[PDB]
Each structure stands twice: as C-alpha cells, then as structure tokens.
Amino acid sequence: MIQITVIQIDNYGPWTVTPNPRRESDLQALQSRLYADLNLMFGAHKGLVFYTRFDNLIAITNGIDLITHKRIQESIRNRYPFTVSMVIASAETPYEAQKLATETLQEYGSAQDENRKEVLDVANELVVDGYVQIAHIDINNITGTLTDIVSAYDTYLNVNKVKLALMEELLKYNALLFFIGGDNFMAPSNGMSEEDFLDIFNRINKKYKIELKAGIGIGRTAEDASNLADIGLEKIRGKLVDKNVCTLKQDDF
Amino acid sequence: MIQITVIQIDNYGPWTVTPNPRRESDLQALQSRLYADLNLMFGAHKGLVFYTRFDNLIAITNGIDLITHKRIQESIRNRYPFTVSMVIASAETPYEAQKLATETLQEYGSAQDENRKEVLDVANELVVDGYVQIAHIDINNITGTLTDIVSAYDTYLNVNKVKLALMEELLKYNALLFFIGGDNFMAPSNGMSEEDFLDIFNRINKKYKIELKAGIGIGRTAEDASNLADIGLEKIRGKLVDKNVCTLKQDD
Amino acid sequence: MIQITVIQIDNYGPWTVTPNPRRESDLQALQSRLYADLNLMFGAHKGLVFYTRFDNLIAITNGIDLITHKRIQESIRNRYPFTVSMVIASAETPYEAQKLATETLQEYGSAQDENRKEVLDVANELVVDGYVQIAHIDINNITGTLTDIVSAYDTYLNVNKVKLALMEELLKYNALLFFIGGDNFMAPSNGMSEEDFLDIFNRINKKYKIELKAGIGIGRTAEDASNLADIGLEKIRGKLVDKNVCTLKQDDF
Amino acid sequence: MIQITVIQIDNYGPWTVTPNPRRESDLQALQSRLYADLNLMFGAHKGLVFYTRFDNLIAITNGIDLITHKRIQESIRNRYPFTVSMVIASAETPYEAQKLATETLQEYGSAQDENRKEVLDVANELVVDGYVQIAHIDINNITGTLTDIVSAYDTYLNVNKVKLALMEELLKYNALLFFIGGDNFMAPSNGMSEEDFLDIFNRINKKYKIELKAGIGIGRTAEDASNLADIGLEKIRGKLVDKNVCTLKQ
Ligand SMILES: Nc1nc2c(ncn2[C@@H]2O[C@H](COP(=O)(O)OP(=O)(O)OP(=O)(O)O)[C@@H](O)[C@H]2O)c(=O)[nH]1
Ligand SMILES: Nc1nc2c(ncn2[C@@H]2O[C@H](COP(=O)(O)OP(=O)(O)OP(=O)(O)O)[C@@H](O)[C@H]2O)c(=O)[nH]1
Ligand SMILES: Nc1nc2c(ncn2[C@@H]2O[C@H](COP(=O)(O)OP(=O)(O)OP(=O)(O)O)[C@@H](O)[C@H]2O)c(=O)[nH]1
Ligand SMILES: Nc1nc2c(ncn2[C@@H]2O[C@H](COP(=O)(O)OP(=O)(O)OP(=O)(O)O)[C@@H](O)[C@H]2O)c(=O)[nH]1
Ligand SMILES: [Ca+2]
Ligand SMILES: [Ca+2]
Ligand SMILES: [Ca+2]
Ligand SMILES: [Ca+2]
Ligand SMILES: [K+]
Ligand SMILES: [K+]
Ligand SMILES: [K+]
Ligand SMILES: [K+]
Ligand code: NA
Ligand code: NA
Ligand code: NA
Ligand code: NA
Incomplete structure (x- = not known):
C-alpha cells in the first residue's frame, strides 16, 4: 500500500502580510523555489512531490523514513524565512492516506497557530x-x-x-x-x-x-x-x- | 493599454523524451526554477509572470522594452538545456493582448519545430x-x-x-x-x-x-x-x- | 569614473549559531544561492557581482540607480532569513571607490549590530x-x-x-x-x-x-x-x- | 578511512566560448547554482561539497554508494546545459584519496574531450x-x-x-x-x-x-x-x- 506525506508551511498567512504586504513576484519565486527544493531532496530518496496549493503540498514517500523527513525539515528551516510541518500516513488508497495524515496534523493545531511549528508525526505506520x-x-x-x-x-x-x-x-x-x-x-x-x-x-x-x-x-x-x-x-x-x-x-x- | 508578453519553451515536448524520458522530480524542479527566475528577472524591471502551463507562460510587461526582453532570453539560453521564444502585444483588454501575441508567435512556426528557436517580436506596439x-x-x-x-x-x-x-x-x-x-x-x-x-x-x-x-x-x-x-x-x-x-x- | 556597491549580510555571525549551529551543506547552498540571485538581479541591469567573502560582496554598478538598489534589497528581505546592507561610491579607481563605500557603511555601525539593518546610502555620488x-x-x-x-x-x-x-x-x-x-x-x-x-x-x-x-x-x-x-x-x-x-x-x- | 569524490564538468571549456563567449553574470549564477544543488543532494545523504575551482569540485562521501552517485549525476544531466563525471576513492589521508580518484579520472581522458562524458568509477573501494x-x-x-x-x-x-x-x-x-x-x-x-x-x-x-x-x-x-x-x-x-x-x- 501507499505512504503519503502532507507538508504545510507553518503560520504562513500572517507572515505574508506582516508587517506589510510583499511583492507578489518575490512570493512566486519563494514558493516555486520551495517546491523545486522539495522535489530535489525527496527525489534524492526516490520520492515525488506535487505542488497542490503551494502553502500545502502532497508527496508520495514509500520507503522514505522519519529521520530522512526530519533532515529535509531541518534543511528548510536553515534556508527559508519559515518552517514546515509534516505528517505521514499509509493506507490502501491515496485518498485514505492523505485524509489520515491531515487528521493528525489538525489534531496538533491550526495552520495559523504561531505556537504550532514543525510538527512531524506518523498517523498510523510507515509502509514496509x-x-x-x-x-x-x-x-x-x-x-x-x-x-x-x-x-x-x-x-x-x-x-x-x-x-x-x-x-x-x-x-x-x-x-x-x-x-x-x-x-x-x-x-x-x-x-x-x-x-x-x-x-x-x-x-x-x-x-x-x-x-x-x-x-x-x-x-x-x-x-x-x-x-x-x-x-x-x-x-x-x-x-x-x-x-x-x-x-x-x-x-x- | 496593457502590454502582455507570451513566453514559450522551444521544442520542449521532444526534449523531455529524447534520447529517453526523464525523471519527473527533475522536470518539476527544472520547470519551477525557470518560473522563479522569470519573476526575479522580469520583477527586477517591475513585471509579473504567471505559471500558466509551465511550458507556456503569460507576463504583464508594461514599461519593459525589447532589448530587456532580449537580455532575459539570452540569460535563459546561457543557463538551461533549452531556449524560449517571446512575443509582445498591447491592447485595451488582457484577453485581446495575449490573443494578438499568440497569433504572431504562431506565424513564425510550430511549438514543436526545432528550427523555430528564440522568436522575439512585437505583434503591434509597445505601450508608451x-x-x-x-x-x-x-x-x-x-x-x-x-x-x-x-x-x-x-x-x-x-x-x-x-x-x-x-x-x-x-x-x-x-x-x-x-x-x-x-x-x-x-x-x-x-x-x-x-x-x-x-x-x-x-x-x-x-x-x-x-x-x-x-x-x-x-x-x-x-x-x-x-x-x-x-x-x-x-x-x-x-x-x-x-x-x-x-x-x-x-x-x- | 567607476561605481562600486558594497553589500553586507546584516548581523550574520550571530544568526548562524542562534539558537544552535546550522548544518554546513545548508549554509553553502544558502550562500551560493544569494550570490547567484544578486548576479541575476544586478545582471538584469547590466551590473556584475563578485563573491568576495560571501557575507561581504563587491559589485560594479555603473548605470544602476538608488531606487533599483532598494528594490533588490527588498527582494532579499522577502525570500531569505536575513537582510542586507548596501553602500554605493564612485571614484577614479576601483580600490578608492570600495574604500569610500565601506567607510560610509561603517559610520552606520557594526557588522554585528542587530539594530543596524538594511543600510542603503551613497558615499559621494552616483556616476553620471x-x-x-x-x-x-x-x-x-x-x-x-x-x-x-x-x-x-x-x-x-x-x-x-x-x-x-x-x-x-x-x-x-x-x-x-x-x-x-x-x-x-x-x-x-x-x-x-x-x-x-x-x-x-x-x-x-x-x-x-x-x-x-x-x-x-x-x-x-x-x-x-x-x-x-x-x-x-x-x-x-x-x-x-x-x-x-x-x-x-x-x-x- | 576517508572516501572522496572528485566531480568535473565535462568538456566545459569549449562550451563556455562556443559558438560565442557567454555573459559573465550568467556563468557565475550557473556555477553557484550547481554548487548549491550538489550540497543539497549529497547533503541529503550526509555528504559535503567544497567549491574548489567551480569547474572541478571535491566532496567527502563516506557512506554514499555508487547508485546514489549515479542518480545525482542523472539529475544534473536532466537540468543543466552540461554533464558531470565523478570518480570515488578511499585512503587514510584526504590528500591521497583525491590523488587516486584524479588519476583514474585522467585514465578515462581529457577534461576537454567530447567523447568522455559522465565517467562514474571507483578507484579502489567504497569505505565500509x-x-x-x-x-x-x-x-x-x-x-x-x-x-x-x-x-x-x-x-x-x-x-x-x-x-x-x-x-x-x-x-x-x-x-x-x-x-x-x-x-x-x-x-x-x-x-x-x-x-x-x-x-x-x-x-x-x-x-x-x-x-x-x-x-x-x-x-x-x-x-x-x-x-x-x-x-x-x-x-x-x-x-x-x-x-x-x-x-x-x-
Ligand atoms: N500568492 C500569495 N498567496 C498569499 C498571499 N497572502 C496570503 N496568501 C496565501 O493565503 C493563505 C491563507 O491565509 P489567509 O488568506 O490570510 O487566511 P484566511 O484564513 O483565509 O484569513 P482571511 O482571508 O483574512 O479571512 C496563506 O497560507 C497563503 O498561502 C499573497 O499575498 N500572495
Ligand atoms: N511534466 C511533464 N510534462 C511533459 C512531459 N512530457 C511532455 N510534457 C509536456 O507536454 C507538452 C506537449 O508535448 P507532447 O505531449 O509531446 O505533444 P503532443 O502535441 O501532445 O503530441 P503527443 O502527445 O505525442 O500526441 C510539452 O510542451 C511539455 O510541456 C513529461 O514527461 N512531464
Ligand atoms: N561557512 C560558515 N561561515 C560561518 C559560520 N559561522 C560563522 N561564519 C562566518 O563568520 C563571519 C563572522 O562571524 P563570527 O566568526 O562569529 O565573528 P567574529 O567577529 O570573528 O567573532 P568570534 O569568532 O567569536 O571571535 C560570519 O559573518 C559568517 O560569514 C559557519 O558555521 N559556516
Ligand atoms: N568564469 C569563467 N570561467 C571560464 C570562462 N571561459 C572559460 N572558463 C573556465 O576555464 C576553464 C578551462 O578552460 P580553457 O581556458 O578553455 O582551457 P585552457 O586549457 O586554459 O585553454 P586555452 O586558455 O585556450 O589555452 C573551464 O573549465 C572553465 O571553468 C569564462 O568566460 N568565465
Ligand atoms: Ca483568505
Ligand atoms: Ca500529449
Ligand atoms: Ca570568527
Ligand atoms: Ca585558459
Ligand atoms: K502579495
Ligand atoms: K517524465
Ligand atoms: K556550521
Ligand atoms: K564570459
Ligand atoms: Na489568502
Ligand atoms: Na504532454
Ligand atoms: Na567565522
Ligand atoms: Na579558462
């Protein structure tokens, strides 16, 4: 069965307008660059990431473990103005898989809670x-x-x-x-x-x-x-x- | 009057499978980087670019002249495994502007014609x-x-x-x-x-x-x-x- | 007359170590990506940047005005975990020009002063x-x-x-x-x-x-x-x- | 035992000046982007890369096997106007490891030979x-x-x-x-x-x-x-x- 990772930028909405709004052309570059990096780094371990909504992304990660996810999370923290949370779930169908992953994420808190940062968890199990x-x-x-x-x-x-x-x-x-x-x-x-x-x-x-x-x-x-x-x-x-x-x-x- | 520039990757479809198909994670990183670079470079001159279909892009380019367009086109050629064509048009409405721009591009040749490399033209006029x-x-x-x-x-x-x-x-x-x-x-x-x-x-x-x-x-x-x-x-x-x-x- | 712009990452040393030291592969990627963006963006205005020490960079900027410098500074602010200071000077020789620009920068304060952010000034005048x-x-x-x-x-x-x-x-x-x-x-x-x-x-x-x-x-x-x-x-x-x-x-x- | 990988842009010299010389700001972005990608990708496997001369780089790759090297090489080929060759060696001292890797790369041919694309070899052994x-x-x-x-x-x-x-x-x-x-x-x-x-x-x-x-x-x-x-x-x-x-x- 299929393992899926849901990836979310922490508390992104307040950042984009605080203290002022930001040039749209810079936010497009920032967002595409994140996406490009995520495919190179997950791609390094035979994964694939789809862009989805940009502030939220879906990745197929069969065979990529929790420690590797943590090191990708740490790379984003060191080079970006924000952090990312990641929850992993397995299930027989893709839709089942992402629904479980998202449920655990939401259990930790709002996509706009400054105290909620760098979640990293497994909802059920990693696909052996x-x-x-x-x-x-x-x-x-x-x-x-x-x-x-x-x-x-x-x-x-x-x-x-x-x-x-x-x-x-x-x-x-x-x-x-x-x-x-x-x-x-x-x-x-x-x-x-x-x-x-x-x-x-x-x-x-x-x-x-x-x-x-x-x-x-x-x-x-x-x-x-x-x-x-x-x-x-x-x-x-x-x-x-x-x-x-x-x-x-x-x-x- | 709005000025629109249409941007196309020359002969892109054949490149993605010649000599063989390419890892998709690479193609996503490549496409996204091209999109990010176009926004920095057009952004440096107060333009804006929308990803659209990734092999085809629409930019708003009021105030950006022909030689700057050429300079940006040169930079992509120097750094990517492919080239891009760009055509500029003005009109009263956005829809009309990109229509005029696509039509001129199409006069020059097919999206998958390897001899149609690096078109750079103005369909009608630059907005003054x-x-x-x-x-x-x-x-x-x-x-x-x-x-x-x-x-x-x-x-x-x-x-x-x-x-x-x-x-x-x-x-x-x-x-x-x-x-x-x-x-x-x-x-x-x-x-x-x-x-x-x-x-x-x-x-x-x-x-x-x-x-x-x-x-x-x-x-x-x-x-x-x-x-x-x-x-x-x-x-x-x-x-x-x-x-x-x-x-x-x-x-x- | 040659125009030189000195560029410096504001309060960089403390950032690389607070709250902990950061992985070096990530700092190499970050530092290289900053230098590349400065060449693309100054390049788009017919300038050229040399990497120098990475936290301090020197650029030839004849024909590039103060507003354009500010717009580039802003782009870095929107996409990176730090800000940059810039000072412009013109002189008959390269060594003279960068010496004047460095001196004005230093008047504003120290390379590791957290309240010295985004300096932007000309030391004498822009080359006409x-x-x-x-x-x-x-x-x-x-x-x-x-x-x-x-x-x-x-x-x-x-x-x-x-x-x-x-x-x-x-x-x-x-x-x-x-x-x-x-x-x-x-x-x-x-x-x-x-x-x-x-x-x-x-x-x-x-x-x-x-x-x-x-x-x-x-x-x-x-x-x-x-x-x-x-x-x-x-x-x-x-x-x-x-x-x-x-x-x-x-x-x- | 340290394991070192030497990386070289194949036939780079002819590419930079044919059919014309290329704008310098672009070459600086290209070379820095390559350096950056290599650190993220080898970094993803706990390696580290040093820029060296830009057309020629040196990496410490203990624990990174040959298949992972091949896939990084493939990623560069899919995204750049050029290809890279890579040779791996181990030894007690950093200096000797890079020396052995280079000699083996040189056995395959010149840094400016068009037929010598994407070498990938080990000079002696991968370090266990x-x-x-x-x-x-x-x-x-x-x-x-x-x-x-x-x-x-x-x-x-x-x-x-x-x-x-x-x-x-x-x-x-x-x-x-x-x-x-x-x-x-x-x-x-x-x-x-x-x-x-x-x-x-x-x-x-x-x-x-x-x-x-x-x-x-x-x-x-x-x-x-x-x-x-x-x-x-x-x-x-x-x-x-x-x-x-x-x-x-x-
Ligand atoms: N491209 C782009 N995306 C933005 C911008 N501002 C906000 N966003 C996106 O909008 C998302 C949601 O944030 P908000 O719109 O502030 O959230 P909201 O819950 O809808 O709050 P309100 O709209 O104020 O009711 C963020 O995660 C970003 O992805 C922007 O200026 N440009
Ligand atoms: N992400 C991605 N895009 C692709 C891939 N292959 C082709 N494309 C895109 O598909 C576009 C059109 O190419 P083709 O599908 O080969 O052209 P076609 O005109 O539809 O010809 P046929 O599909 O052979 O009938 C190109 O411009 C690319 O944008 C691929 O493997 N991945
Ligand atoms: N590559 C890299 N550069 C670093 C690192 N840590 C600090 N630097 C650089 O060092 C520069 C100066 O900062 P510090 O070395 O902390 O400053 P210092 O004034 O020498 O202070 P002390 O070393 O404590 O005596 C920074 O601007 C960074 O460029 C690091 O971990 N890696
Ligand atoms: N930054 C930069 N590097 C270049 C440029 N042109 C060539 N190089 C570098 O120069 C290296 C060696 O190439 P060449 O200078 O052609 O080699 P050469 O063996 O010295 O040959 P000749 O100088 O013609 O005798 C290449 O691998 C590139 O790294 C350039 O315009 N800019
Ligand atoms: Ca909203
Ligand atoms: Ca098709
Ligand atoms: Ca020090
Ligand atoms: Ca030479
Ligand atoms: K905005
Ligand atoms: K593909
Ligand atoms: K460090
Ligand atoms: K050159
Ligand atoms: Na929004
Ligand atoms: Na297609
Ligand atoms: Na230091
Ligand atoms: Na040379």
Whole structure:
C-alpha cells in the first residue's frame, strides 16, 4: 500500500502580510523555489512531490523514513524565512492516506497557530512492503489541435476544464489527480484497473472532444512507478500497443 | 493599454523524451526554477509572470522594452538545456493582448519545430502611455472553514472548483485569472469596475457557499498595480472600508 | 569614473549559531544561492557581482540607480532569513571607490549590530558619465599542463598561488582581483594600460613558470566592459593579435 | 578511512566560448547554482561539497554508494546545459584519496574531450568502516579587528593570505583546506592531532598577527564530523574549554 506525506508551511498567512504586504513576484519565486527544493531532496530518496496549493503540498514517500523527513525539515528551516510541518500516513488508497495524515496534523493545531511549528508525526505506520501505482495521463496531439491554433489563454482554459473533470471522476475511486505541466497530469491510483480509465476517458471525450492516453506504472517507490508510467506512454506513441492505456510492473528484482 | 508578453519553451515536448524520458522530480524542479527566475528577472524591471502551463507562460510587461526582453532570453539560453521564444502585444483588454501575441508567435512556426528557436517580436506596439489593473482575490476565512476542517485534498478540490468558476465568469469581461497559492487568485482586468466584481461574487457565493473579497489596484506597471491591490485587501480586513471590494490608484 | 556597491549580510555571525549551529551543506547552498540571485538581479541591469567573502560582496554598478538598489534589497528581505546592507561610491579607481563605500557603511555601525539593518546610502555620488575597464585574465593551456596531469587538489593550490600574486601586484595600481572559476580572473582596473599588464605577466611567468593572457574591455557598464574583455581573449587565441594582451572599446555606431 | 569524490564538468571549456563567449553574470549564477544543488543532494545523504575551482569540485562521501552517485549525476544531466563525471576513492589521508580518484579520472581522458562524458568509477573501494575528521578553523574577532576597521577589499586580502598560508602548512600532513565564507575554513584532516594544529597556529600568528581557533570533529560521515566540529567551536567561545582547539568524537 501507499505512504503519503502532507507538508504545510507553518503560520504562513500572517507572515505574508506582516508587517506589510510583499511583492507578489518575490512570493512566486519563494514558493516555486520551495517546491523545486522539495522535489530535489525527496527525489534524492526516490520520492515525488506535487505542488497542490503551494502553502500545502502532497508527496508520495514509500520507503522514505522519519529521520530522512526530519533532515529535509531541518534543511528548510536553515534556508527559508519559515518552517514546515509534516505528517505521514499509509493506507490502501491515496485518498485514505492523505485524509489520515491531515487528521493528525489538525489534531496538533491550526495552520495559523504561531505556537504550532514543525510538527512531524506518523498517523498510523510507515509502509514496509507496499507499492505505488501512478497513471501518467496526457492529451493526444495538443500541439496540432490547440497550442498552434488557439490563443495561449484558451489552451490554458481548456486544460483546466479537463483537469477538474478528471479530479471529480477519479475521486470516486479514491484516486488523486495533479497537473505537472503542458497537457500532462499524474494520478496516484492504487486499486484502479485499465478498464476504469477507459471508462473515464470515454466520458471526457464525449463532453470535451479531447482524446486522452495513459501509461500506468506499478513499483516499490514513486520514482519507479512514474518511470514505468513514462515508458508506457512511449509504447503507446510507438504504436506497439493497440489501446490508449498501457500498464507496466516493476520486476527487476 | 496593457502590454502582455507570451513566453514559450522551444521544442520542449521532444526534449523531455529524447534520447529517453526523464525523471519527473527533475522536470518539476527544472520547470519551477525557470518560473522563479522569470519573476526575479522580469520583477527586477517591475513585471509579473504567471505559471500558466509551465511550458507556456503569460507576463504583464508594461514599461519593459525589447532589448530587456532580449537580455532575459539570452540569460535563459546561457543557463538551461533549452531556449524560449517571446512575443509582445498591447491592447485595451488582457484577453485581446495575449490573443494578438499568440497569433504572431504562431506565424513564425510550430511549438514543436526545432528550427523555430528564440522568436522575439512585437505583434503591434509597445505601450508608451498605458496602465495595468490587477484585482487580487481571496476567500474569507479559508483556515476556519476548510484548511483546519477537511482533508488537504478536499480543500484543493474546492479551491480548484472556485478557480474555474472565476475563469468562466471573468472571460465575458475579457479578463484573465491565475492561481497564486493558498486561497489567492490574480485577475488582470482593465475595463472592469467594482460593481462588475460584486456581481460575479454573489453568484459565486450562491453557488459554492464561499465568500470572496478583492483589492483592485490600478497603476503604470504590473508591480505598482499588484502592490496597490494588496493594500486594498488590507483595508477590507481592517474595516477601513465597508464592502468586499476596494479600488486604489497610483495618484490617490 | 567607476561605481562600486558594497553589500553586507546584516548581523550574520550571530544568526548562524542562534539558537544552535546550522548544518554546513545548508549554509553553502544558502550562500551560493544569494550570490547567484544578486548576479541575476544586478545582471538584469547590466551590473556584475563578485563573491568576495560571501557575507561581504563587491559589485560594479555603473548605470544602476538608488531606487533599483532598494528594490533588490527588498527582494532579499522577502525570500531569505536575513537582510542586507548596501553602500554605493564612485571614484577614479576601483580600490578608492570600495574604500569610500565601506567607510560610509561603517559610520552606520557594526557588522554585528542587530539594530543596524538594511543600510542603503551613497558615499559621494552616483556616476553620471563614467566608464568601467575590466581585464579578463586566463592561464594558457591549463588543461595540458595541470588539469590532465596533476591531482585535483594540486591544480587548486597552483591556481590559488597565482591568484594571490596577481592580488598583490594589481593593488599597487589601485585595481582589484577576483577569481571567477577555472583558471580565470577578473580585474576592475580603471587607470591601467596594456604595458602595466605585460609587466605584471612577465614577473608572474618568471616566478611561477605559467603563461598569462588577458583581454581588456572598456565600456559604460560592467556587462559592456566584460563582454568586450571576452572578445579580446578569443582574438588572442585566434592569433588575430600578436601579443598576450588585447584592448577593445565600446562603439555603439 | 576517508572516501572522496572528485566531480568535473565535462568538456566545459569549449562550451563556455562556443559558438560565442557567454555573459559573465550568467556563468557565475550557473556555477553557484550547481554548487548549491550538489550540497543539497549529497547533503541529503550526509555528504559535503567544497567549491574548489567551480569547474572541478571535491566532496567527502563516506557512506554514499555508487547508485546514489549515479542518480545525482542523472539529475544534473536532466537540468543543466552540461554533464558531470565523478570518480570515488578511499585512503587514510584526504590528500591521497583525491590523488587516486584524479588519476583514474585522467585514465578515462581529457577534461576537454567530447567523447568522455559522465565517467562514474571507483578507484579502489567504497569505505565500509571509516571515519572523517574535519577541523573547522575560524579567526578570533574578525569583526572588531578587520571587518569594521579596514576596507572591504583589505579584509578580503588578509583572509586570502591566511588561506594560502594554511593550505601550504596543512599539506605537510596530507590535509586539505577550503574557504567556506567569512573568516571560516574547513580541513578534512584525518591523522592530525590537536598539537599539530597548535604548532601551525603559532606560525600563522607570528607571521600575520591573526589568532585562530578550531573545533575538530570525528564521525562516520561528513555531516556528523562537521556538526561535532561546530559544537567544538562553541565550547571555545563559551570559555568552557581552556585552549583554542577542541575535539569531539561521535
Ligand atoms: N511534466 C511533464 N510534462 C511533459 C512531459 N512530457 C511532455 N510534457 C509536456 O507536454 C507538452 C506537449 O508535448 P507532447 O505531449 O509531446 O505533444 P503532443 O502535441 O501532445 O503530441 P503527443 O502527445 O505525442 O500526441 C510539452 O510542451 C511539455 O510541456 C513529461 O514527461 N512531464
Ligand atoms: N500568492 C500569495 N498567496 C498569499 C498571499 N497572502 C496570503 N496568501 C496565501 O493565503 C493563505 C491563507 O491565509 P489567509 O488568506 O490570510 O487566511 P484566511 O484564513 O483565509 O484569513 P482571511 O482571508 O483574512 O479571512 C496563506 O497560507 C497563503 O498561502 C499573497 O499575498 N500572495
Ligand atoms: N568564469 C569563467 N570561467 C571560464 C570562462 N571561459 C572559460 N572558463 C573556465 O576555464 C576553464 C578551462 O578552460 P580553457 O581556458 O578553455 O582551457 P585552457 O586549457 O586554459 O585553454 P586555452 O586558455 O585556450 O589555452 C573551464 O573549465 C572553465 O571553468 C569564462 O568566460 N568565465
Ligand atoms: N561557512 C560558515 N561561515 C560561518 C559560520 N559561522 C560563522 N561564519 C562566518 O563568520 C563571519 C563572522 O562571524 P563570527 O566568526 O562569529 O565573528 P567574529 O567577529 O570573528 O567573532 P568570534 O569568532 O567569536 O571571535 C560570519 O559573518 C559568517 O560569514 C559557519 O558555521 N559556516
Ligand atoms: Ca500529449
Ligand atoms: Ca483568505
Ligand atoms: Ca585558459
Ligand atoms: Ca570568527
Ligand atoms: K502579495
Ligand atoms: K517524465
Ligand atoms: K556550521
Ligand atoms: K564570459
Ligand atoms: Na504532454
Ligand atoms: Na489568502
Ligand atoms: Na579558462
Ligand atoms: Na567565522
């Protein structure tokens, strides 16, 4: 099963406006830099982080322990104007996992309590022998159908419509959905089958007239899972699979 | 008149898979760093940049001339595994400006044409006497209603539902809408008035049960307009004004 | 006339140790990231920053005004766990200029005074019509004589021996010397001539058995001057010039 | 036994000037960003990296295996306009470890050969039971004596004289010396004793009238060693040790 870490900037709202408001262009840089660092440092141990709302983030951390989490927390404290709290939870589905993690976080106190800083806890347990399933979803021919033909903002609008439709659809399976740039989305989705995605894609195509494909990788860590998902997408592209979904499992054991 | 610059990574799609696919954690760090650098560099000249789709970005660039754009483009080439193209356009409304800018980019060639490297052009003209209006929009008490109450993913889904509702609504006015983190959004909106915002807001409250406020800053550059809009949010919070919208202008 | 800005991290020593000492990998990353941002941001206005001691940094800022300095200071304030002080001076020579700017800074108070935050002042005046001369200095064939032949640490020693020799020689002409990487050095050096450089290079060769070359650029900004120095170095390499120094000056027409 | 990794930007020289020379402010940002990333990424595994010459860096990597090295190399390739080669070696002294790693790197080819990309090798062995010793050297009262008294460049000058003097001294013991900012230096110094530094420190004071102190830390990784060296410096400052050197072990 899947281990997930929820990450929150401590008491961030008061900081951003106290003693005055702060240049937005600096806060964008500050926020992206945090995100970039978190992916390098969790990435160093085969994790993956999605940006979510920026002041709150979700990470798949199968195989990353409590001491490693503490050292990443300590690195942020030494180089940033703020601290971060982190709670870990495991569960059979991604949605179960983050819900438990968030519950324990909230038990410690408000996201705006100056006394509440650098929480670091495990809600139930760390995953000893589990797995992550990631589906890497992509639009067929975004460049010829949107990027090169309609405005920058209309492509962005259209991609945000598909994104929300996919979020509502996937939530029925306790699966999560995150934008990763371009026309690309990743869905932590332990428990879903290929036939589940083919259903969702039929509905998205009927509503929005957009064609979707996905590689599904299953592995021991987020890194392994997403690498296998990338190969699936190439297989589909090189027409060495019939359909718009492809599953690959890790077996280099 | 607002000036918009559209920014595109040249031939980005083929690079991410040639010779092979690349670890996604690396691609996230790369994309985020490019976004951060663009805000520092355009910010150094009082511009502002929205992440948009990460391989395509929209910036407000009133007051930033062609040679500065070129300098910024050179800096990315010297430091990244790829290049970027940029086209500038002016117009009365934000929507029109980026439309004009995209159209000229498209005349030069495809987003995935390896011989279309480093376009740098002006679709019509650079703004010499213009202004920027930015509305900075925020949800009331996100902490007490959602962040401290429901799961992380549930607050994320709800904020994204509000985001798309606001994108649809604002487009009738030829305004744009971008997420900037937590419960905040920014809307380049030359043409709109306080009453246009108050109208959109109670429709959103009726539908989603969330209450919004907004500071409207009007200035000569993205930075001035965004700075003023931030002050309007503080006036609403401090009860120095009695409605959920507040306009401040550079020469008040 | 050359314009120099001295930049100093306010009350830095106490911060690195309060409440405890901080992990050194984190301070190296923080310090390097600050120096990079100052080059991007001053660079965006055609300036150039040298890392100097990291908590104290020296920059050439001809053509960059007081408001722009303030905006850069503010950006650091919004994204880092400390603030920075800056003082600007202009003078006929680099050594004079930074000496004046340092003295004004010192009048405001101590490097470890917690109530001395975000100094920003000019010591005399901002250069109105002035110029920058930069010499870009480099060792002939580092790769064949040292990099590919001797240990990593042995090239590092020899490169540092030459660095100190140049520092001391150049000081007699009121010029500065900073290491920019590899086997490369930059010398702001308003007042010096090609012959002065050939005289220094002669002594260094005789003493260390290493051969030096330099392009000298003269321009209105640090970017103009240092781009021109770069071209000079390529001309020496391409034997378009018959000596180990080459001067190029800015001509917009 | 100390384990050292030498890191080199492949064929960097031709890249900086082809097809044209590149703006210097950009190259400074690029090189500093690379240095910073390398410390976060090796740091995430309890290593430490010193900038050295920027195109050539030296790292202490006790406990960091070959697979972790390969993945860091891959991260750089995915995000920079260039690639890096890395060779690892162990030995009793820092100086000999870096020497053996370099010779092996040189066996693969020139630092300016385009076909020699992303070398990754071990010269002898990865250290299983080793230790690192790091002395963290600092100048007593730089602020009152130099920073607040003389010009920016004058203090920079004196700190660089002390730096070269220490490099040459420490090399007699096969120890390395790196500037880390301010008035601070680190010396991987496996072998040396407190009295060894006390002799070096006497000579530097007699020649330059600069008074030095050092916390010395002995641990199983670079991170452990330098954290203990930091505690050492604080004991000296807190006057709860007698002299100007101070050792803590893990
Ligand atoms: N995060 C992320 N973005 C990607 C990845 N691969 C491609 N992209 C993005 O996808 C965009 C469009 O590229 P493609 O998907 O290859 O183009 P396409 O036009 O849709 O062609 P096909 O998808 O092959 O039908 C690029 O500009 C990138 O932004 C990836 O692995 N990760
Ligand atoms: N991008 C950006 N985000 C901000 C800014 N100010 C606040 N935020 C975000 O807003 C989040 C929530 O803080 P607040 O809006 O102050 O919290 P609230 O509970 O909604 O309080 P009120 O809006 O005053 O009722 C923070 O965690 C930040 O992520 C800003 O200026 N720019
Ligand atoms: N900071 C900086 N470093 C440079 C620049 N150009 C080259 N270098 C560095 O110089 C190092 C050695 O490259 P070269 O100078 O071409 O090598 P060389 O072997 O000395 O060859 P020649 O000088 O042509 O004889 C590279 O690895 C870079 O680190 C530059 O413009 N700025
Ligand atoms: N890299 C690095 N630099 C440090 C560290 N601690 C302090 N510094 C630097 O040292 C500079 C001067 O501060 P101190 O060394 O505490 O000041 P001092 O005036 O010499 O005081 P004493 O050392 O107590 O005699 C700071 O500005 C920092 O650059 C550290 O742990 N690592
Ligand atoms: Ca696609
Ligand atoms: Ca709010
Ligand atoms: Ca050379
Ligand atoms: Ca000291
Ligand atoms: K703001
Ligand atoms: K990928
Ligand atoms: K330290
Ligand atoms: K250069
Ligand atoms: Na794609
Ligand atoms: Na907010
Ligand atoms: Na060189
Ligand atoms: Na110090």
